[PDB]
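[SOLVED] Predicted holo structure with flavin mononucleotide

Edit: marking solved, answer below. Original request kept for reference. I posted the sequence and ligand SMILES and asked for the 3D complex as structure tokens.
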Amino acid sequence: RGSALSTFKHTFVVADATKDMAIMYASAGFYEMTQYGPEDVIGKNCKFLQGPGTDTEEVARIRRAIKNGESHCGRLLNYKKDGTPFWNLLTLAPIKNEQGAVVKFIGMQVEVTQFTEGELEKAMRPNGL
Amino acid sequence: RGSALSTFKHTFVVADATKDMAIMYASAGFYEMTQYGPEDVIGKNCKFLQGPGTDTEEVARIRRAIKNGESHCGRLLNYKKDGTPFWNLLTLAPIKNEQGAVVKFIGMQVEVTQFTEGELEKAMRPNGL
Ligand SMILES: Cc1cc2nc3c(=O)[nH]c(=O)nc-3n(C[C@H](O)[C@H](O)[C@H](O)COP(=O)(O)O)c2cc1C
Ligand SMILES: Cc1cc2nc3c(=O)[nH]c(=O)nc-3n(C[C@H](O)[C@H](O)[C@H](O)COP(=O)(O)O)c2cc1C
């Protein structure tokens, strides 16, 4: 779901389009998923998460989305502070003013884990039994 | 966020990998976003949403994800029952048994709308003021 949003429940960052898309904000979930702290993250471009085997063509689609002011999603290999790799389903959306110009982007990250048959059944079942 | 999941809050479908990826389940949000009903959706492949200008190369990445049993996200133009186009950020994840084989896929759809500066500030602000 997502794109109400909550800085305490959800994993997202906000980039300043006035500032070469530097991170100007990160949610609690971001620090928790990546293991980085505000002193590492704020003011940096979010590509410090990228590393060996990060797909160059997915990065290029992200870049084009950003350049065009479009929403976008893509799967990217990323790395936590301790070097652990994870798959990140990254959702991006532009934020505009009234002038119709992009002032910021929000990126929502999802760390892919295994969804098992058991947990899916519970979601599908329309009650609490 | 997403990939607990709720059939009443979230927009998703579940496909049966035993059945040429026919939809075997759809959430309340799916029927509400697409305007289709269970009598249209259940048993069909979800490409009835695709239409003019749906990107062929995004569809091909989805197909490859499905074939490889990988999670995936991508932005796809889709159409509601009344013909209205919408951008769908589609997230896909495989569901496996214990044998380690893919029995189902879950797809979570997000209809892209405008995120405004005002609603973003409220999300970022760490309180209810
Ligand atoms: C709001 C936002 C969030 C982003 N989050 C991530 C992220 O979680 N992981 C990642 O690898 N790249 C992320 N990116 C992409 C990188 O910051 C960067 O835009 C991409 O690598 C292209 O950089 P370049 O054009 O300088 O090469 C994000 C971008 C934005 C605007
Ligand atoms: C669980 C699941 C959900 C899907 N949801 C959507 C959807 O919301 N919109 C869409 O255009 N395609 C969706 N697809 C993709 C199509 O069903 C189909 O897999 C894709 O068009 C490739 O079809 P083909 O290999 O038969 O050409 C979904 C697929 C799965 C497995």
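OP edit: The two ends of chain A are 24 Å apart (CA to CA). Thanks to everyone who chimed in.
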